[PDB]
Amino acid sequence: IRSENITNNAKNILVQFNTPVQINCTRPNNNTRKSIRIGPGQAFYATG
Amino acid sequence: PQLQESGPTLVEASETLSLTCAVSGDSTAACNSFWGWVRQPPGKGLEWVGSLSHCASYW
Amino acid sequence: LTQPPSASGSPGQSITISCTGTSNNFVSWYQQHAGKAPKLVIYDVNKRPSGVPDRFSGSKSGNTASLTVSGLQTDDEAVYYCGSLVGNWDVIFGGGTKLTVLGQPKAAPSVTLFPPSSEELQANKATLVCLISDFYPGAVTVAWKADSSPVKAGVETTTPSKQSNNKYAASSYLSLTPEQWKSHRSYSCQVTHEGSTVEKTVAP
Ligand SMILES: *[C@@H]1O[C@H](CO)[C@@H](O[C@@H]2O[C@H](CO)[C@@H](O[C@@H]3O[C@H](CO[C@H]4O[C@H](CO[C@H]5O[C@H](CO)[C@@H](O)[C@H](O)[C@@H]5O)[C@@H](O)[C@H](O[C@H]5O[C@H](CO)[C@@H](O)[C@H](O)[C@@H]5O)[C@@H]4O)[C@@H](O)[C@H](O[C@H]4O[C@H](CO)[C@@H](O)[C@H](O)[C@@H]4O[C@H]4O[C@H](CO)[C@@H](O)[C@H](O)[C@@H]4O[C@H]4O[C@H](CO)[C@@H](O)[C@H](O)[C@@H]4O)[C@@H]3O)[C@H](O)[C@H]2NC(C)=O)[C@H](O)[C@H]1NC(C)=O
Numbered sequence: 043i044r045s046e047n048i049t050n051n052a053k054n055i056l057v058q059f060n061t062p063v064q065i066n067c068t069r070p071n072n073n074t075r076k077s078i079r080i081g082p083g084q085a086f087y088a089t090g
Numbered sequence: 091p092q093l094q095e096s097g098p099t100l101v102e103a104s105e106t107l108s109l110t111c112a113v114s115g116d117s118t119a120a121c122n123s124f125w126g127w128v129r130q131p132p133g134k135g136l137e138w139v140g141s142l143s144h145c146a147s148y149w
Numbered sequence: 150l151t152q153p154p155s156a157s158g159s160p161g162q163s164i165t166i167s168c169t170g171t172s173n174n175f176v177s178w179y180q181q182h183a184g185k186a187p188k189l190v191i192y193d194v195n196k197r198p199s200g201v202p203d204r205f206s207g208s209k210s211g212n213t214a215s216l217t218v219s220g221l222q223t224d225d226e227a228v229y230y231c232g233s234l235v236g237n238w239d240v241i242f243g244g245g246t247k248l249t250v251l252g253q254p255k256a257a258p259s260v261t262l263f264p265p266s267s268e269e270l271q272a273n274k275a276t277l278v279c280l281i282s283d284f285y286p287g288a289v290t291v292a293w294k295a296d297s298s299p300v301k302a303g304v305e306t307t308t309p310s311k312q313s314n315n316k317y318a319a320s321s322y323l324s325l326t327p328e329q330w331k332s333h334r335s336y337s338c339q340v341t342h343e344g345s346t347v348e349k350t351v352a353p
């Protein structure tokens with residue numbers, strides 16, 4: 043348990059874990075890239 | 091869009107029946123529809139066989 | 150899914166065929182002409198596909214799904230199957246409803262029953278054939294009986310076919326052993342046409 047000033051509630055409290063916690067973050071949307079052409083030479087990737 | 095069936099019209103019992111469909115005018119890669127078979131016994135009702143698709147998910 | 154066996158109507162009239170066992174809205178109906186491939190006439194209940202007349206309309210009330218064809222015509226004569234998604238991804242089909250828009254006039258069937266021959270019994274085989282013809286509509290169910298109790302075994306019935314006189318005809322084949330043929334005196338063949346039945350009997 044780590045904090046700059048503990049009794050002070052204005053200071054954040056940094057915590058360091060012993061065992062790692064498994065976390066899953068996914069994007070349950072299967073997408074496609076438009077890759078529209080806004081030239082000359084430049085190409086923007088739109089969300090299809 | 092046209093579907094053309096091809097294969098042996100006469101097969102012996104206990105053997106392996108193989109049939110192949112040739113699609114025309116559309117891609118099997120398309121995620122809009124599934125592809126499979128439906129068999130209709132002579133003078134009988136329609137029976138569903140099965141279908142699949144490569145368009146998958148994360149698991 | 151339970152689909153009514155038959156359905157009839159005159160040109161211009163409206164026919165409504167039902168289907169049950171559908172708890173979901175995935176219900177769909179198909180039209181299959183004899184000697185041809187099935188074609189989807191409706192999907193997602195009421196919704197119509199491309200090149201399909203407005204007179205075809207799907208409907209579902211409670212557990213019952215219904216198709217309605219108004220303004221009947223010659224090309225509407227075919228077998229109509231219904232189907233729907235169930236549970237997770239499986240799909241099933243009904244027995245189908247045969248709708249006929251054939252021309253007049255209606256007529257009682259005609260049954261001719263032939264007992265096995267003398268040469269056939271010598272081959273240790275016994276087969277009785279019911280010949281049904283000259284009936285309207287073209288859908289008929291056939292039943293067999295040995296003495297009084299019915300016969301559930303050896304029954305082969307095929308879909309009727311139109312004749313040169315435009316009257317439908319069908320034949321049911323009963324194949325059994327010569328032992329049960331000689332034991333039971335009379336064999337009855339029941340032919341049910343539009344409620345009314347026509348019966349024939351043969352004994353050696
Ligand atoms: C999310 O959605 C997307 C769609 O938006 C889904 O993406 C689809 O995923 C499926 C499944 O993987 C892909 O099918 C694979 O196809 C490849 C070939 O892909 C190339 O060709 C495709 C067809 O191009 C043709 O048609 C188009 C359209 O008409 C036309 O324009 C073109 O000119 C051409 O005529 C292209 O579509 C495809 O483009 C894709 O990729 C591009 C980048 O490459 C990208 O820019 C595009 O935008 C597009 O996304 C590409 O050019 C097949 O090779 C592959 O088959 C292998 O893989 C599958 C699993 O993926 C496996 O089941 C198969 O069995 C097979 O695996 C065997 O073969 C491999 C070699 O071929 C080998 O390496 C394997 O080890 C394995 O071999 C072993 O097993 C076999 C038996 O299985 C055995 O015989 C061997 O000896 C050995 O033991 C796939 O079928 C789609 O292409 C893809 N895209 C689309 C648009 O559908 C995605 O799935 C969804 N889900 C997720 C989670 O993302």
Ligand SMILES: *[C@@H]1O[C@H](CO)[C@@H](O[C@@H]2O[C@H](CO)[C@@H](O[C@@H]3O[C@H](CO[C@H]4O[C@H](CO[C@H]5O[C@H](CO)[C@@H](O)[C@H](O)[C@@H]5O)[C@@H](O)[C@H](O[C@H]5O[C@H](CO)[C@@H](O)[C@H](O)[C@@H]5O)[C@@H]4O)[C@@H](O)[C@H](O[C@H]4O[C@H](CO)[C@@H](O)[C@H](O)[C@@H]4O[C@H]4O[C@H](CO)[C@@H](O)[C@H](O)[C@@H]4O)[C@@H]3O)[C@H](O)[C@H]2NC(C)=O)[C@H](O)[C@H]1NC(C)=O
Nearest residue numbers: 043044045046047048049050051052053054055056057058
């Ligand atoms: C990290 O965080 C921590 C906390 O998270 C921070 O700690 C905080 O530190 C500050 C210091 O800057 C503290 O404030 C200071 O508190 C002291 C002590 O006050 C207490 O005790 C007093 C006396 O107690 C004894 O006496 C009684 C009576 O007999 C007994 O019953 C007791 O048991 C004791 O024996 C008492 O008077 C105090 O009460 C008063 O104050 C509180 C707090 O405000 C009120 O609630 C009360 O109602 C009451 O009013 C208290 O209980 C004080 O002495 C300090 O005052 C100096 O500073 C003032 C400015 O803030 C200034 O105005 C005053 O005049 C006074 O200055 C005097 O003293 C200087 C030094 O000698 C002289 O130079 C000067 O000239 C003048 O003479 C001050 O208020 C916080 O309390 C403390 N936080 C907590 C929660 O306690 C820390 O700062 C952080 N650090 C870092 C680096 O981040």
